[PDB]
Each structure stands twice: as structure tokens, then as C-alpha cells.
Amino acid sequence: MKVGIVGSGMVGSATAYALALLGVAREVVLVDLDRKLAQAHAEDILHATPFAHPVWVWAGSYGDLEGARAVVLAAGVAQRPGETRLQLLDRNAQVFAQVVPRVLEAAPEAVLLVATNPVDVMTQVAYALSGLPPGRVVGSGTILDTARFRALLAEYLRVAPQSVHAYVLGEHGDSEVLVWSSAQVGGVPLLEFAEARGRALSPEDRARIDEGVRRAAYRIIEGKGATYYGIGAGLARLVRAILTDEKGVYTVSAFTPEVAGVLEVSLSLPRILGAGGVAGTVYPSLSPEERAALRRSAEILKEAAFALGF
Amino acid sequence: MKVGIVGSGMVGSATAYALALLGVAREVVLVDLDRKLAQAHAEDILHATPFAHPVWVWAGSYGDLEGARAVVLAAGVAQRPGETRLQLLDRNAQVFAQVVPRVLEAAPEAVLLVATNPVDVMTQVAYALSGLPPGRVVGSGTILDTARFRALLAEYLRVAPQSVHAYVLGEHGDSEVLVWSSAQVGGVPLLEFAEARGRALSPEDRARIDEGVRRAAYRIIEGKGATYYGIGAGLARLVRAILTDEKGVYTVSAFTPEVAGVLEVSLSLPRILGAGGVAGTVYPSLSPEERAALRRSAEILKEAAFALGF
Amino acid sequence: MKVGIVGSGMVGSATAYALALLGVAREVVLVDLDRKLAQAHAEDILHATPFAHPVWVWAGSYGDLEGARAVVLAAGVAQRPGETRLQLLDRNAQVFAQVVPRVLEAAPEAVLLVATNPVDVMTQVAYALSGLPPGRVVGSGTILDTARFRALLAEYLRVAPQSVHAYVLGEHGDSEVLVWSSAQVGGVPLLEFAEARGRALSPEDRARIDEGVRRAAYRIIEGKGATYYGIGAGLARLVRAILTDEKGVYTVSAFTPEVAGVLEVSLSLPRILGAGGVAGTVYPSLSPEERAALRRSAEILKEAAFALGF
Amino acid sequence: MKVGIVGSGMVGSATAYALALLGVAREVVLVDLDRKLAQAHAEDILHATPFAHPVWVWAGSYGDLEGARAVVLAAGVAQRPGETRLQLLDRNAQVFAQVVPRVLEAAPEAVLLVATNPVDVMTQVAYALSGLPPGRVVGSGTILDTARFRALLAEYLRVAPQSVHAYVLGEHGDSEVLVWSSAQVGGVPLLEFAEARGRALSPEDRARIDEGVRRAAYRIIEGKGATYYGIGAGLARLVRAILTDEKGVYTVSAFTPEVAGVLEVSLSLPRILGAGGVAGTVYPSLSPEERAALRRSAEILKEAAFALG
Ligand SMILES: NC(=O)c1ccc[n+]([C@@H]2O[C@H](COP(=O)([O-])OP(=O)(O)OC[C@H]3O[C@@H](n4cnc5c(N)ncnc54)[C@H](O)[C@@H]3O)[C@@H](O)[C@H]2O)c1
Ligand SMILES: NC(=O)c1ccc[n+]([C@@H]2O[C@H](COP(=O)([O-])OP(=O)(O)OC[C@H]3O[C@@H](n4cnc5c(N)ncnc54)[C@H](O)[C@@H]3O)[C@@H](O)[C@H]2O)c1
């Protein structure tokens, strides 16, 4: 099986590396206008393979994507000095204008996995451009936020992260909604479990955890300018779910007909992920307060998309 | 890094195999009355390791349990077609009067993991004979029924069982309690999930799932004489939780001071499992109907234990 | 991807279990005339899945094999009292005469992986009956003996087995050929490695290791009546090589136009294994003595095939 | 078990990533002078772990190396485009005079795994500074070159590199020695295998593979600025071998009393790697041309090191 990655910067290359070391696919192809860059990463990654799993890793053009079951779009351009957010958006939206049709020409059955920030808008862009059914185009969304939510809650409760089933919904960013109400730990509603552990989730404890999720990427950016290792592994896990027809639930971004009363918007909800992309979308049980917050997040996103021309 | 298994029969050897396939422990010692059988199982599994994970599997005497962090008790008779697990109690209680002290003498710090049926009462028997702290003696309990419930719902919904959150409490047997009330997929109550998936779960569908879980062992025993693959993997998973001090949350059996008004009885509840056995116990809020079912189940077990003086 | 297993005895079910715990394939289908037997193994293994990887395991008919990329043939019939082993072969050959065309009817592009003993002759039978090209029908052959040879050499040299590259060729059985001459350890010719290690291999060392390989199965049989764990994982590994298009080398059995002067015989040689089955057959460097032994092994298999009518 | 990484730049961080992805160790600590860098990397990798294996990755001081079974040394400058590894020598030797004592102060029983270039000389430097037995100081050596050789052969032959047995000895650098003479696939000498597969390796083909291996780092550095993915995984593998007492055989660098007639030089040969480092060294028979080249390699390293030394 073959996976494509368009954009061979730190995010695309870290994804390719995680795919290789975890042996997710037999073939991994990197595409980037900076040909020498994609080649250099493909070569560096190929050289890791004898220490792990056999993977044909190479750099090529869109034609090399033929047969790809998933293609990761990590093709965000580098922000110029004093360019501002909205300008960057346009440039990136225009890159996608060139990338999407050329990917789908070579790999007409590919699931598209958008990584480019802001993921929700870019997922909307990719969806619109693709002309594909809504489930075929997915963005990394809140996948890392959700994992981080579980990790912090797990530390708080003194249990394994794998036992904590909690979600982050909506925008990958400031308006993300931590869903406390219907969270569970090893089958136990979170409230009953916290009590069993001598923990009352005070509003101040939850506030602590909330900020911990929201601010996570901040220290990484501050310390080295960009994050890629975390997201690389997250994308590799999503690719695995697609390629293996897993039908496991992930919080990823996708075009959504209606959510919390807002219409036609791309954002994160728990979704069943398999061979054709999203196999079905789940709408979690929310408290009135969480619903209001999701509504606000969707409104923020809808408006940001509309403003771009989408 | 060392685990012991007492009883290298179908259940004991499948456990060793799963441990090896899942790369759980560096050392697995098989202790059987029949040394040749255990040695054969050990060599057979050893020949599997080149195709999985490096593991030293070998056959020894009880003394060879020295240093084991966990010891699985899988010795004793299994139920035949017309028999319930409770009807094995007197035969297997005599066996544990021999097994338990021999394990305690060779490996006094080992967490005991009980597989022998009826697993709940045999857990009680092991706890009583061991003289160990309550949390250090754990029975597999409903870990297998929970997996069955999740797998059957997975088949029904076409969602991977990792994302199907439902469990079984009480007796590993005819009086077990399926906890429909809190069952959940992607943060949505199970029945609402199935509804939205156009796969609504009618009372007849639920009755069918229930029989599928409750009579699983009986069907398998009818078809092939014994069950062992499912429990094998479950035991390997619990062994991993102990070895890694995972603090994962599982529905396993252990001595319970009070549950649903019944005193001093071993049965399954959601518990935190780690390096010293049970680290904590949860008493979930059940539906009124489930709560009453759990009471009858605890009452059944307390009665059976009491008849032998446990 | 989908894998089928025809024959749900201990070998078939152990293979399915290894496939499931290792997450080699998304779908595993067990097919056996004894429908209740297959169903019982399929349920038992399905219940293991929530502890490891999502796999749809079920029991079905040949029709259910549609789209399977590999099908494991472990369909051997049970010996009757007084029945000769030759008479047993006859009955197994008749079984294969039914199994092979029904499998291929449902999964025309499937690689057939023969597990039934004697594996070389049954590989020959499957190949003749299939009507496929020789690379499409592979038998487990000496996969376990090769691994065993490496383990014993590794033990002798005090090195990791993964660093030992040596092969057992020919018949899976008494006429097996250990290739000492061209074996290497970490890139170094075996004799130089041992010499450097200050452990030159004497005739006595080679004889002991030879017996260690050549009687390994007998020892397991004598203790528990049949082997299945080892070959289950071995078969699972070969299935994985096929499904991932690994192009790795394995000593597996396949029809061979000419080897050591003998014509048209199935026996084990190091073969490149991937999507279509064997992608190439390697003929290792042999000493006169090794070549003489291989010729004899080939002659023995050729005579047995001919005797059976193949 | 715990592993430490000193130098949390591209190599150190990629090593941590590979360790996390392969589930090699339960605990990985990153140490750097730039604490914010190490912290950013550790948190970035920590966020990957939910999608791979439970691993506690964090950034700490030298003191925090305590209990580490192995410490990877990846601190120091890397080569700029068009720069040789030997040109890093004076600068990185100065780095190691600070690094090495500090590591052994916190973790006296750790096997040292040297990545910093030029690896062979740096391995020699670490050995001299350490006071440890020669086997406890191991350089990644030609482990990467060997992998490159196998990978390029894999692409040529269409065979998984696991099944291509070829290696590189000597300097991790321009004088390295590709050992064509004993390369094998499935027990068949490489050239005979290739011929029988319908793809004979001509002299021109072999020369291209040589350039492919020998100059791989210069190309990658021209194209993206640094190499790190290849060595990251190779270091994770070597760390796994140490932690697990694997006794796997790898072409790694270590102090060598005599090789090809040259005395007291650190360079790569096939060695057994386990707990406590190098368990033994093999001196394979080489073609006359390979042995002369290995000799040259040893002489070059010894002379380059002589400057202190
Ligand atoms: N979910 C569950 O907990 C679960 C599931 C399946 C089976 N089981 C149970 O596990 C038990 C074992 O079933 P089995 O199929 O493996 O039986 P086997 O296949 O008959 O295994 C029993 C082995 O224990 C050995 N043995 C007996 N007494 C011993 C002693 N004092 N010391 C050492 N070894 C001893 C025997 O020699 C025998 O090999 C049964 O009680 C069965 O009901 C439990
Ligand atoms: N096969 C190989 O052996 C191989 C392959 C690739 C790179 N390398 C080498 O590895 C080294 C690291 O490369 P890099 O790309 O990561 O460089 P970076 O990306 O420049 O990494 C270097 C880090 O070392 C840190 N450092 C310096 N002195 C320190 C000290 N006293 N204590 C703690 N940290 C200190 C620096 O702060 C810096 O973050 C280079 O020498 C490079 O040539 C070797």
C-alpha cells in the first residue's frame, strides 16, 4: 500500500518518518516544489528503514502518487516577515487550489488528510476544491488536543491515558470545547470515577486542565519555533486507520452539515475512520454549557471560512 | 520481567502464547504437574518467538516461580456441557489448597492472577488461603465477558471494539450484569448511537446480545471442547498491567468488603490495576434494574463461598 | 485486507490467533466442514480482539473467502486407528482436491499457503491442482527449522538470533539440509565469526546442533501430541510478508523446476516473498557435502510425490 | 529503563523520536545547554506517544541522567554544506571535554553511545576522557553507512534491506570501506544473486552505489541542512541492543588495539553489542583491496587524531 505526502517540511517529513518506523505502509512518496528538499528527506528516511521495517521511500511528482490510498497535505508555505495571518491564509488557499486537483488526478480514490493550519479552514478549502463526498476529506483537527486532554486527566486521576475516553471538539485552537460531561474512564462516568479516586473535579481543577490543553503547542513554538513530532505521529495514526479500515473513533476535522445549530462547517467531532475516510460522525452528549461553547466555536469557524471565500 | 503460569493446559498455554505474541514479558515459566507437557508447550511457543518478540519461555517446578511479579493460576477442571462454573468449586477448592501455599512459598511477593473457575469464588479461596492483602489477589472476573460484550456490539455496529465502551459486572457466569445504562460510543449513549447509525438496538436485539455474551463459553465448549484464546489474551493484558504498573481500569474480581449491600464477597467491579494488584475500586451508579441484578449476583457468590467456609 | 484459513484444527486456529493478536489483517475467516468447530474457534479468537487489535474474525464457507489475499490450507484429516500414514496421505490428497478449487473459485487471486503435513508433498499437490504459476503456492516448509538452526547457532556463539543468517533447505523432515558453509553472522562468514569468538565449531558441536534442529518437532509431539504454536506464528509471519509485499527472504516450500539434478519437485529454498507469493528463488552457495544432501532430500520428495501420483 | 540524550538538536531529538516510536525505553531524558530547546523537543515528542508507545520523555539537567543505562552523546556542531566531518574535530573535542565528565558524574555506569562527528575520533576522545574500559564507549560508526549500503542495494535488487547482507567498515566518512567481497543475499554472493535476478551489477553500477553511500550525508545536508532521520533510528537500535543485552552484531566504532597493522585507533568493525557495551570484536577477512583500504582508513584517523591527542 502507498501513502503520499505533499509538502516536505518538518511536518510532512516527520509524518513520513513515523509512517516508516511504524511500518504503516510499504511505500511512502514525498512531493515538494523544492525538489532537493523532498529528495533529501526521502533519502534520510530511507536510510532509517533497515533499522525497522522495509518501506520504499522516495521523492517524486504528482504522477508518483498513483495508487495512493491516502495523501497527506502538509503543503503550507513559509510566512513572510510582516505578512499577517489573513495573507498567509490566501497564499495557502491558493497552494491548495493547485495541489488538490493534481493529487486527485493521480490518485482519484485517495483520502485527503489535511495538516496545514488553520486545519479547520484548510479542511473546508480542500473539501470544496475536491468535489468529493464530505467523508473523503479529513483534517487532523483536535486529534492532539484530545490526546492531551486524556493525558492530563490521566495524570490527575492517577490512571492510564488509555483508560480515559474524553474528547476535544470544534476548532483546533482557542475556541476548542473540552467535553467533561460525558467523559468516561474505563467505562465509568467521569464524575463517579473521580470520586472513587478522592478527586472532586473542582471548576478550578478543570480550568487548570483546560489551559494545559489549550497552551500545549505554545511552549514548543517558544522553544524551537514549530511543532512537528507530535502531529507527525498523529497523522501516521490516522493514515494507519484509513489504510487498515480500522473503523476506530478519532476527533478529526471534516465538512459538517449541521452542528450545535450551525450549518455547513468544518470542525472536529468524534468520527469513525476507515478505508473511505469518515465512515460516520458521532454527536456526543453535551451539557447546556458545552453545547453553547460548541455553538460558538462553529460560529467562529463558519465566519472565518465565509471570509476566505468558502 | 518474569511471570509464572501454574497449569500449562489449554488456558495456561494460550496465555503463554499471547504473552509471547504481545511481547509482554522477557521471561515466562510454566509450572504443571505434567512436566513433559509444560516443556513441550514451552518449546512450541519458543519456536514462535523468532516471528514475534524475544521471550524466554521454559518449564519448571513451583520453586522456579521465584522472582515472578505475577503468577497466573490456571489449574483445575473446566465445565462440561451440562455444568455451570459454580459446580466446579469443590473440586477446584481442593486443588487451590495445594497450589496456593506452594506459590506463596516460592514467590511471596507475586500478584496472584486467578483464572481457574468459578473464577470469583476461586479468587476468594486464593485470597483466604494466601494470607495476602486483598488487592494482591485478582481474578480475571468479567474481563472476558466485557470483551465479549464489546466485540459483539462491535460486530453489530461495524465499529472497532476499542471504540465500543460497554462492560459487564458481577459474576463471571450466569448471573453477570451487562451495564447498558452507561454504555457509550464517541461520547453518545449506546442506544442513541445505534439509532443514529440506522442500526437501532431493539429489546430483541439486546436480548440476543445478552445471550451472545452470557452463553459464550457454553457455545465455544460445545463447538471445540474448551475456551482458551479469549481468556489467554485477557490474562496476558492483565499481566502487562501489573508488570508495567499501568494503572489501567479493568473489570476484574477481588475481595469486596461491601457491594450492593452484600458483605465480604469477591466479584467483578471496575478496578485500577498496577504493580501491586488492585490500586483502587469503583462502585458505579447503576440503573435501578442493574443495581438489583448485581445484588442477586453478589448474593449467589457469597452463598457459594459460604458453603465451603469461605 | 482479508486472510482465509481452511481447516480450523489446532494449526489453523493458532494461525488465526497469531494473525489476530499481531493485527496482521483486518479480516480473518475460518472455514471448516465441522461448522461448529470453526464457529467456536472464530468466536473464541474474536473475543481476544478487544485486548489487542481490531480484527473481524468469523467462521464462514468458501464463498466468504472472496477478496482474500492469502489463504492458509491447514485442512488435514484425522487418522483412523490402523490406517497407514500412506493411507492418511491419500485421504489428505483427496481433501486438497476439493479444497483447492473451491478456495480459488472464491478468491482467484489468493496466494495459497500450505500448512498440512507432509508440507512439501502437500505443497506439490496444491500446486498441481491449483493451475496457478509456481510462485502462487507456497508451503511453510523449513521456516521453523531455519529459525531453530539460527537460535542454536546464536546460543553457541553467544549472539542474538537476529544476527545469524543461516538456512535449512530441502524436505521439512528427516532429510533436511543445514547450510553451514555459506552461513554468516552480522555480515561475517560463520567460521570466521566462531573462530574470532574463540569457539571453533567441532564435528561434535555441529552434530549436537544438527540433532537440535532435526528432532525439535518430535520432542514437542512426544510431550503434547502435536505442534501448533510455533507454526501458527510462522504462518502468521509468512501471511504478513505476503500482504505487505515485503520482498523478504524465507525458506519456504514451492514447486521447483530443477534443484541439485532433480526435476519438478517442491522443497524449501530461500525465497523472496511478497504480494504474488514467491518473487524469486535463491540457490545458496553449498559445499559438496551440502549439495549431495540436498540432492538426496529432493530425490526423496520426488519419489513420494510420484508415488502419490504427482 | 532510562536512556539519556545529551545534545537535543536535530540528531538528539530525532533519536528521542525514534526511541519513542519504537518503544525502546520507558524513559527518555533530553539534556541541552539550551533548556528551552530540549523542553520544546521533549514536549513535542511526548505528544506523539499516545499514538505509539507509553514513554516518559522529558528535558532535564546533567544530574537528571541518573540511572540511565545508556547515554547518547549528540552535542556539538554538525557539518555545514560541503564541510567534511573531520573538520569538526577541534571544536567538538572541546565540547566533549565539557560533556563527558558531566555525564559520568551523573551516570557512572552508563554505556556511552557517541554520535557527534567525526564519530570515530570523538569516540576516541570520549574513551580517553572517560577513564572507562574501552568496551563501554561505543560510536555509531558505520552503522548508518552499512544501512545506506543495504538500502541502496535493496532499491537496486527490489529486496527488503533486512535480507541484503552488506556492510561498511573503517572511518564513518570519506575513507570508509564498502565490503563488496562478502555481501550476500539468501546465501548467494551478491553479484551472482544480482546476475541471476536479471540485473547484473556492472562496474558502473557499483560505482554509483559507492557514491550513493559514500556521499549520502553531503547530498542530504545540501538539500535540507542536516542529516538526522537515518542516524536517529540507528541510534535507537543501538540503544535497544544495550538496554536489552541483545548481543547483536553491528558495525560500530570503538577503541581498537590493532587493525590492518595500525595500532590504537578507533574505527568501525563488526562487534557484539550488549549491556555494558562492546562484548567482542570480529576482524573479518577482506579482499586484498579492501584490507589495503581499511588500512588507509585507519592511518587517516590515527593521523588526524594525533593533533592533541
Ligand atoms: N474467563 C475465565 O476465567 C476462564 C475461561 C476459560 C477457562 N477457565 C478455567 O481455567 C481452568 C483450566 O482450564 P483448562 O482448559 O486450561 O484445563 P487443562 O486444559 O485441563 O488445564 C489444566 C492444567 O492444570 C494442571 N494442573 C492441575 N493441577 C495442578 C497443580 N496442583 N499444579 C500445577 N499444575 C496443575 C493440569 O496438569 C493441566 O495441565 C478451568 O477451571 C476452566 O474452567 C477460566
Ligand atoms: N552517523 C553519525 O554519526 C551522524 C549523523 C548525523 C549527524 N551527526 C552529528 O551529530 C552531531 C549533532 O548534530 P545536530 O544536527 O543535532 O546539531 P544541532 O542540530 O546543532 O545539535 C547540537 C546540540 O548540542 C548542544 N550542545 C552543545 N554543547 C553542549 C553541552 N556542553 N551540553 C549539552 N548540550 C550541548 C547544542 O546546544 C545543540 O542544541 C553533529 O556533530 C553531527 O555532525 C552524526
Side-chain angles (χ1 to χ4, degrees), chain B residues 62-212:
Chain B
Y62 275 86
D64 294 318
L65 293 165
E66 171 78 36
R69 303 266 186 86
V71 179
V72 176
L73 308 185
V77 290
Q79 71 270 19
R80 313 246 203 170
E83 252 174 340
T84 74
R85 307 178 180 75
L86 292 170
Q87 288 178 289
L88 307 173
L89 178 50
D90 271 303
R91 280 167 288 167
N92 287 343
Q94 292 182 358
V95 176
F96 273 33
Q98 303 297 317
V99 170
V100 168
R102 279 174 179 80
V103 175
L104 265 280
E105 184 171 25
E109 274 103 75
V111 175
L112 300 182
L113 224 201
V114 182
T116 303
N117 272 321
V119 63
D120 297 293
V121 197
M122 297 310 304
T123 291
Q124 180 76 45
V125 169
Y127 164 58
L129 296 166
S130 83
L132 300 166
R136 299 210 24 245
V137 181
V138 181
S140 62
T142 55
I143 209 203
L144 183 51
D145 315 272
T146 288
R148 289 165 168 162
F149 192 15
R150 299 177 75 174
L152 282 167
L153 283 167
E155 280 189 322
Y156 187 90
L157 305 163
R158 310 317 295 176
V159 172
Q162 77 203 42
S163 294
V164 175
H165 301 291
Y167 59 16
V168 178
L169 302 180
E171 178 193 13
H172 174 63
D174 295 339
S175 65
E176 68 194 11
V177 188
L178 278 53
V179 184
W180 296 90
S181 62
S182 58
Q184 195 184 78
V185 181
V188 174
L190 181 53
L191 302 190
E192 291 178 27
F193 177 77
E195 261 283 48
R197 287 274 277 174
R199 298 295 324 263
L201 283 159
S202 75
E204 342 199 334
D205 295 315
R206 297 168 220 167
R208 222 192 259 90
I209 296 287
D210 181 283
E211 168 164 352

Side-chain angles (χ1 to χ4, degrees), chain C residues 158-160 162-163 165 167 182 184 186-188 192-193 197 246-249 270 272 279 282-285, chain D residues 158-160 162-163 165 167 182 184-188 193 197 246-249 270 272 279-280 282 284-285:
Chain C
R158 299 164 301 225
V159 77
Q162 44 267 46
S163 286
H165 305 99
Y167 305 105
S182 50
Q184 293 194 338
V188 189
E192 309 184 2
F193 192 91
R197 197 73 169 176
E246 192 178 295
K247 303 304 201 208
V249 170
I272 306 169
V282 191
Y283 304 79
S285 179
Chain D
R158 304 322 284 183
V159 172
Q162 75 201 42
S163 293
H165 303 106
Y167 62 16
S182 60
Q184 260 192 6
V185 175
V188 169
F193 177 73
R197 288 274 289 172
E246 186 187 280
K247 297 158 186 163
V249 186
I272 311 265
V282 180
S285 75

Side-chain angles (χ1 to χ4, degrees), chain B residues 10 13-14 17-18 21-22 36-37 40-41 43-48 50-52 143-144 147-148 150-151 154-155 158-162 216 219-220 222-224 226-230 232-234 237, chain C residues 10 13-15 17-18 21-22 26 34 36-37 40-41 43-52 54 56-58 143-144 147-148 216-217 219-220 223-224 226-234 237:
Chain B
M10 298 311 168
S13 70
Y17 194 40
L21 288 168
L22 300 167
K36 282 159 187 168
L37 168 73
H41 273 312
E43 292 176 6
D44 197 5
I45 299 179
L46 199 70
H47 304 166
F51 311 102
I143 209 203
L144 183 51
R148 289 165 168 162
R150 299 177 75 174
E155 280 189 322
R158 310 317 295 176
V159 172
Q162 77 203 42
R219 292 195 305 279
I220 292 168
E222 204 64 77
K224 68 171 184 159
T227 86
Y228 47 91
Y229 286 130
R237 194 65 195 79
Chain C
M10 292 310 298
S13 66
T15 300
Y17 191 55
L21 295 196
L22 299 169
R26 190 64 185 87
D34 185 338
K36 283 210 290 78
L37 171 65
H41 278 300
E43 294 193 50
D44 200 17
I45 295 159
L46 174 71
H47 304 161
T49 65
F51 300 114
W56 301 121
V57 185
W58 75 101
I143 186 75
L144 262 45
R148 190 86 228 113
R219 272 185 277 274
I220 291 162
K224 77 176 199 165
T227 74
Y228 48 84
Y229 288 135
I231 189 64
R237 188 65 183 83

Side-chain angles (χ1 to χ4, degrees), chain D residues 13 17 22 28 33 60 63 74 85 119 150 157 164 185 210 217 246 269 271 273 289 301 309:
Chain D
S13 71
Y17 196 40
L22 300 170
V28 177
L33 298 180
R85 300 169 184 86
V119 224
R150 299 172 76 171
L157 299 166
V164 178
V185 175
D210 183 278
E246 186 187 280
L269 294 165
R271 297 180 221 257
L273 186 62
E289 297 92 332
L301 283 163

